[PDB]
Amino acid sequence: ARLANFLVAIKXKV
Amino acid sequence: ARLANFLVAIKXKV
Amino acid sequence: ARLANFLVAIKXKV
Amino acid sequence: ARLANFLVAIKXKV
Ligand SMILES: [Cl-]
């Protein structure tokens, strides 16, 4: 798995 | 934590 | 740039 | 449209 972060504002390991 | 899916093709809990 | 789609819920060329 | 950014590492509006 792989650290991940998303930003859409709304902003968080896959 | 909430489900996260992404598609960039490369395609994966937040 | 690549077509991209995200799901975090909120669900959208980067 | 809204800023979108992603980091999964692969790292870029909806
Ligand atoms: Cl694939």
Side-chain angles (χ1 to χ4, degrees), chain A residues 1 3-13, chain B residues 1 3-13, chain C residues 1 3-13, chain D residues 1 3-13:
Chain A
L3 290 170
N5 182 68
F6 299 95
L7 178 89
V8 184
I10 268 149
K11 83 171 108 183
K13 189 162 166 181
Chain B
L3 179 78
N5 291 1
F6 67 95
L7 184 144
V8 175
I10 290 187
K11 310 171 192 74
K13 189 143 51 58
Chain C
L3 294 175
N5 207 12
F6 303 89
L7 185 152
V8 179
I10 73 184
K11 189 188 68 180
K13 186 167 192 185
Chain D
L3 179 37
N5 285 338
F6 67 90
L7 181 146
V8 184
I10 68 170
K11 326 182 197 188
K13 77 186 134 153

